[PDB]
Structure formats: C-alpha cells, structure tokens
Amino acid sequence: QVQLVQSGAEVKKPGASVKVSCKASGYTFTDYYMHWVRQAPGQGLEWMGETNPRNGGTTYNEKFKGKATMTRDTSTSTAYMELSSLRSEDTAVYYCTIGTSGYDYFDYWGQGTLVTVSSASTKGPSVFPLAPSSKSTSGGTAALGCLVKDYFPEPVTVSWNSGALTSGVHTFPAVLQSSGLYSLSSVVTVPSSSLGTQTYICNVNHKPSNTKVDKKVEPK
Amino acid sequence: DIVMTQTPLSLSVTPGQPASISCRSSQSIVHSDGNIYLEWYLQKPGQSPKLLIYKVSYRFSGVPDRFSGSGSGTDFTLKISRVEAEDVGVYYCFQASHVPYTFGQGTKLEIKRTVAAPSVFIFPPSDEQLKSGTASVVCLLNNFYPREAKVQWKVDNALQSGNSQESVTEQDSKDSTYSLSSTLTLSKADYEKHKVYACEVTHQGLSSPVTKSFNRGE
C-alpha cells in the first residue's frame, strides 16, 4: 500500500522558515520523482516543482524559485519542502504527490500540511462535551458532540472513538470570532437505546498548540 | 505558462442526469512523446485530490465507468454519463505535458435532491464551560435540503442579535444533505440572568418555524 505521510500543521511568524516533510512507504522511494503542490485561497492548485529522489536533482516552477527549497533523505525515504522568508501569502496547504506510472499524472498524494503565517498569538482550544439528552433526541436517535472553543490558527481535527465511529459524524467548518479565535463543533447521531453501554470519545488535535484531547461524552 | 480555463464554474445536477465539464488550454498540450498528459481530479473538502482520468481519456483504476474524458488540441471534456451522490465536490483539470505543470480553477458539482426538513437539537452549556465563566448554547440542524435555513436565537422569547455564529457543512456524499451548527455565546453572569433558551428554525421542509428550547437548570 503506497502511502505519503506528511508532517503536522505549522504556524510561523512573517520572515521565519518552515520545513515540511513527506514520509514515503509501500514502494521503492528512489523509483519516482516527488512533486510538491500548493493549495492557497484564491490561487487554487499550483505545481511547485519536483525532486529526483536518487540525486536530489530539482526542477522548480519559476514562481516558486527563491521561496521553496526541495530536498530528500533516501535513508529515511523522506522528501522535504522548505519555505523561506515567510509572508501572509504563503498560508496554504502543501501536498507531496507522486505518479507511480513513472509519468507525471499524480495518483498518490500526502494528506497535506497546512502552514499558517501570522503574527497573532497561537491558542490551544478548550474541548467541551455536547451531552446527549431528551433535548437532543429524534425518534430513537440521540445527537451528541464536542465543542472545540477558542483556538488559533487552523486546523483542528476531530475523530470519534479513535476513528472507529464515522457514520453520522458532522465536523463543521470553523467559525472566526471577532477576537480572531476560531471555534468548531463535531457531532454524531447514535442509537438512544445503547447510551448506557457504548462509550463516545471525541479525539481533538490542534498541532500548532500541541493540543491532544480525548473527551468522553457522558449522557445526561 | 499554459493557462487551463474550466467551464462552467459550478453546476447543479439531479442523480441519473448527465454532467459535462470543459477545460480549455491557452496553448497546445502535446508532450514530446506525442501524448497529451491531461488529467481530471476530484477533490472533496478537507481531502487531497483524487485522480479520475489521465492522458485525456484513460480511466484511472477503481473509477466508475460513468466517468469518461475526450479532447484534442486546446479543448478537453470530462463527462459523467449519470451523476450520483458520491460525485459531489470540485473537479480540476491538469496538464503535465509542459513544465510548469498547471491546473484549471476548478468546477464545483452540486447534487439536486428532494426537500428534507432538518432534525433540530439543542445543547445547554456544559458544567465544565460554566466553571470557566462562559456559556455556549449549541443548536444543531441535521441533514436538510436545500442548504438555505434560518436560525434565530431567543432568550426568554427576546430575539438575540450579535452573540451567535454558525456554519454549514459541505454537501453530504451519501445523502446529498447539509447540516448546520449555530452557537450562542454569553458570559456566565448573563446566562444566569435568564430562564428560557430557544433555537427557532425556518426551512423549506417546515410549514411553520420549529422551536427547540430548554429551561436553564432543568
């Protein structure tokens, strides 16, 4: 199984540098070129350049020369993308991608790394339960969730029961409060009959603040 | 550079009906080997793009027979014979014939479905949050269609303004619905001054507004 596993979300002040990693597995790392793609608001998807994993040879999109530096470490099957002299415009999701055919039609992609460039203060969220009650029932079903309040920058990820619970989950887009802090909610609809036997835990991650919370949501 | 222009910018389709997306290149995209490395990707919110079509017409492994590609010179077309709920998202064309490789701006595909009224739920502030001096009340509108929905917060029947935020999900890949979460945030002191907290919902699937409420303490 071909896998491209990227490093977590980062937040940097203007003028700083960041080095995003892409760990490859399930194929011979030196067989295929590693490509980097940017997804920035307004600018859309853009191909940044490619790295030959054998010699570390690189071809850049001219728009990214002097901004991006691509490297590789064959001993760990890891490709790297370093962004220098960070500015607000560098806030984007960065993807590593390969074309296993040996041609540049990309078939496998990393999960992406969100890099945010800001002078605003980083803040970890508070995680509060949205307990199932008679006010959150609908014809034998109960809704429950987690409120992920006051964080900066994006992203917050939420899973339920370590990824074993996905059906009926809605993880809402974050809202931006006047304070400049984000908030989001994640909910799930479950059988009301089994509230006493099943355990519901929301796993909340906010990498920029090293927040990693597993909140058990208790019925009311 | 080679500019890839997609038409239309968005489309709304009933399942079973055909869809067609065009991708125009500013210059020809024939590679030195004689092939046209024109690809079509589908991307869903918060996910990486997924390859559908490569080299103009080749269907990538696992992609449904419903998807097909054609084209020559500067005009390329992605066709969905019969659209399905799972097709929802943004479609991008991509050329890898000449460096630098370039993408189209994307075409958003929306799915039409029948009217579905939301299931409305309300959540009082948690005891944990109340201890921190703040009170957030959450109103959840689950699995409705169309996306247009109106939430109004009422505290002891008085209409609230300026103390709430809401967001809507992307369209569901399985049932083509939307969900909405609205949060009313007050200070704990302001929360303790009132009894009735209500969420009033207006939607096309409802003949009169639906009020979901609770009494603070109960």
Strands B10-13, B107-111: pairing is parallel
Structure tokens of B8? Answer: 């239309």
Structure tokens of A81? Answer: 């993308």
- Residue B64, preceding bond cis, omega within 30 degrees? no
CA atoms of B121 and B213, how far apart (whole Å): 9
Q: In the beta sheet, which residues pair with residue A127? A: A148
CB spacing of B48 vs A136 below 8 angstroms: no
Query: Considering B76, B92, B112, which residue would you say is the last residue of a domain?
Result: B112
Positive or negative torsion for Cα A54, A56, A59, A61:
positive
* Sequence-separated (6 or more) residues with CB below 8 Å from residue B167: A172, A173, A174, A175, A184, B180, B181
* Sequence-separated (6 or more) residues with CB below 8 Å from residue B202: B149, B150, B152, B209
| B103 and B1 inside one domain | yes
Q: What is the DSSP string of B160-198?
A: P-SSEEEEEPPPPTTT--EEEEEEEEEEHHHHHT--EEE
- Contact criterion met (CB below 8 Å) for B97 and B36: yes
Query: Considering B96, B112, B128, which residue would you say is the last residue of a domain?
Result: B112
CA atoms of B193 and B172, how far apart (whole Å): 39
- Contact criterion met (CB below 8 Å) for A39 and B46: no
Lateral strand order in the sheet of B164-168 = B119-123, B134-144, B178-187, B164-168
- Contact criterion met (CB below 8 Å) for B102 and B3: yes
Q: Which helix (H) or strand (E) holds B95?
A: strand B89-95
Length of chain A: 220
* Sequence-separated (6 or more) residues with CB below 8 Å from residue A194: none
Specify burial of residue B189 (Cβ count, 10 A radius: 0-12, 13-18, 19+).
exposed
- Contact criterion met (CB below 8 Å) for B180 and B117: no
- Contact criterion met (CB below 8 Å) for A125 and A149: yes
Type of residue at A42: G
Q: Which residue of A has its CA nearest to B215?
A: A135
| B108 and B120 inside one domain | no
Range of the domain at B172: 113-216
CA atoms of B40 and A201, how far apart (whole Å): 38
Query: Considering B92, B112, B132, which residue would you say is the last residue of a domain?
Result: B112
Q: Name the residue facing A46 among B103, B122, B126 (closest C-beta).
A: B103
CA atoms of A210 and B117, how far apart (whole Å): 40
A182 min Cα distance to partner chain B (Å): 11
| B101 and B17 inside one domain | yes
| B2 and B96 inside one domain | yes
| B86 and B12 inside one domain | yes
Specify burial of residue B217 (Cβ count, 10 A radius: 0-12, 13-18, 19+).
exposed
With an 8 Å Cβ cutoff, the interface of chain B facing chain A consists of 37, 39, 45, 48-49, 51, 54-55, 60, 92, 94, 96, 99-103, 105-106, 119, 121-126, 128-129, 132, 136, 138, 140, 142, 165-170, 179-181, 183, 212, 214
B142 min Cα distance to partner chain A (Å): 9
CATH of the domain at B170: 2.60.40.10
Task: Tell me which residue has tokens 């009033």.
Answer: B200
CB spacing of A128 vs B128 below 8 angstroms: yes
Task: Tell me which residue has tokens 């958003």.
Answer: B108
Q: Where are the alpha helices (DSSP H) in chain B?
A: 127-131, 188-192
- Contact criterion met (CB below 8 Å) for A144 and A133: no
SS3 A197: coil
| B95 and B139 inside one domain | no
CA atoms of A201 and A213, how far apart (whole Å): 10
Q: Give the up-direction half-sphere exposure of residue A35: CA atoms within 13 A in the CB hemisphere.
A: 25
* Sequence-separated (6 or more) residues with CB below 8 Å from residue A50: A33, A34, A35, A36, A58, A59, A70, A104
Broken C–N links (> 2.5 Å) in chain B, after residues: none
CB spacing of A130 vs B126 below 8 angstroms: yes
Type of residue at B107: T
- Residue A153, preceding bond cis, omega within 30 degrees? yes
Alpha carbon A197 to its chain centroid, in Å, reads 32
| B144 and B96 inside one domain | no
Q: What are phi and psi of A76, to 5 degrees?
A: -115, 5
Structure tokens of A47? Answer: 């191909």
Q: What is the DSSP string of A55-124?
A: T--EEE-GGGTTTEEEEEETTTTEEEEEE-S--GGG-EEEEEEE-TTSSSS--EE---EEEEE-SSPPBP
Total structural domains within chain B: 2
CA atoms of B202 and A42, how far apart (whole Å): 33
| B74 and B135 inside one domain | no
CA atoms of A20 and A9, how far apart (whole Å): 9
B35 min Cα distance to partner chain A (Å): 11
- Residue B146, preceding bond cis, omega within 30 degrees? yes
SS3 B216: coil
Name the structure determination technique.
X-ray
Count the neighbouring beta carbons within 10 Å of the beta carbon of residue B161.
Answer: 8
Candidates B123, B174, B213, partner chain A, best to mutate (most A CBs within 10 A): B123
| B87 and B178 inside one domain | no
* Sequence-separated (6 or more) residues with CB below 8 Å from residue B44: B88, B89, B90, B170, B173
| B87 and B129 inside one domain | no
- How far lies B7's CA from each of B16, B62, B76, B78, B80, in Å? 21, 26, 10, 11, 15
| B100 and B117 inside one domain | no
| B12 and B81 inside one domain | yes
Structure tokens of B3? Answer: 């500019």
Domains and CATH numbers, chain A: 1-115 (2.60.40.10), 116-220 (2.60.40.10)
CA atoms of B144 and A4, how far apart (whole Å): 36
